[PDB]
Design a protein around this ligand. Structure first.
Ligand SMILES: OC[C@H]1O[C@@H](O[C@H]2[C@H](O)[C@@H](O)[C@H](O)O[C@@H]2CO)[C@H](O)[C@@H](O)[C@@H]1O
Ligand SMILES: OC[C@H]1O[C@@H](O[C@H]2[C@H](O)[C@@H](O)[C@H](O)O[C@@H]2CO)[C@H](O)[C@@H](O)[C@@H]1O
Ligand code: CA
Ligand code: CA
Length: 270
């Protein structure tokens, strides 16, 4: 009834599928994904109770030495739907057919119920990420003519890569109440084009619904990439980037109780 992955016990890259019906197609995939940590004392453990429906992440790391301080953050412990293009992990048992070309996808709501508890002022975000790639099923990384989209619905102590472009309004739902929220739009080129949407009013816990097309439409419209609508939206990743090159201790706990993607009857790009 309980799935657990644990760093460092399970190796430097713990991860596992969530496959509640045991049919060989995961509904989601979890990774501890401490992708910029070279060494640390302590541990990180992610547990999914299949029976109670709670994803619970506990991290207690110290003596942290990074792989490349120029990458700034330490990692991105996460859960995702679709094909994560950095590795051979995937989860495609869901209602939105990912990967799909941006031009063929419908819009969808993404609803997440969560609670974040960074300890001692640890810089963090709670960020939704998609990667947009030239091939349908990428498993070997990301090229300079491709895109990362991030949507930060919480942050503390981190700013997105690159420079600020503009602010936009996106209608979202927070704790059951519709609200117009403001997002700063940031753009960088860090080996690929990077577009981040940073909410101006961070939400540290609750149930949040966002319309995914509001973000991908603006990411398409400010992009410098050619033939944007031919890219494939590979996945939707949910997790917390954390840390800075000055951070040597990172204690963090969070919980996610629901992730739902709800298809809409309108195109993803408007
Ligand atoms: O590079 C940002 C990206 O890294 C991904 O991890 C890569 C890592 O960068 C590379 O050095 C290593 O060899 O491969 C892993 C993938 O297995 C990480 O998974 C992403 O979340 C992150 O955005
Ligand atoms: O390195 C990729 C990582 O960058 C993070 O932004 C850094 C930025 O790289 C640095 O130049 C700026 O001055 O500090 C910020 C952090 O506050 C970005 O937040 C991450 O999403 C991204 O993975
Ligand atoms: Ca399944
Ligand atoms: Ca993959």
């Amino acid at each position: 009834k309980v799935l657990k992955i644990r760093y460092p016990d399970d190796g430097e890259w713990p991860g596992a599928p969530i496959d509640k019906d045991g049919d060989g197609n995961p509904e989601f995939y979890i990774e501890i994904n401490l992708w910029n940590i070279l060494n640390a004392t302590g541990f990180a453990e992610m547990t999914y109770n299949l029976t109670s429906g709670v994803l619970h992440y506990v991290q207690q790391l110290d003596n942290i030495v990074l792989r490349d301080r120029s990458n700034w953050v330490h990692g991105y412990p996460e859960i995702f739907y679709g094909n994560k293009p950095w590795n051979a992990n995937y989860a495609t048992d869901g209602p939105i057919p990912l990967p799909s070309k941006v031009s063929n996808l419908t819009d969808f709501y993404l609803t997440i119920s969560y609670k974040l508890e960074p300890k001692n002022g640890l810089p963090i975000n709670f960020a939704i990420e998609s990667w947009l790639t030239r091939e349908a099923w990428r498993t070997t990384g990301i090229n300079s003519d491709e895109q990362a989209v991030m949507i930060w619905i919480y942050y503390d102590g981190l700013q997105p890569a690159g420079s600020k472009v503009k602010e936009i309004v996106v209608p979202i739902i927070v704790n059951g109440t519709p609200v117009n929220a403001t997002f700063e739009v940031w753009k960088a080129n860090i080996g690929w084009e990077y577009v981040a949407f940073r909410i101006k009013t961070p939400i540290k816990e609750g149930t949040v619904t966002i319309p995914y097309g509001a973000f991908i439409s603006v990411a398409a419209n400010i992009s410098s990439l050619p033939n944007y609508t031919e890219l494939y939206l590979e996945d939707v990743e949910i997790g917390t980037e954390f840390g800075t090159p000055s951070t040597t201790s990172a204690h963090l706990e969070w919980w996610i109780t629901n992730i739902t993607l709800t298809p809409l009857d309108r195109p993803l790009i408007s």
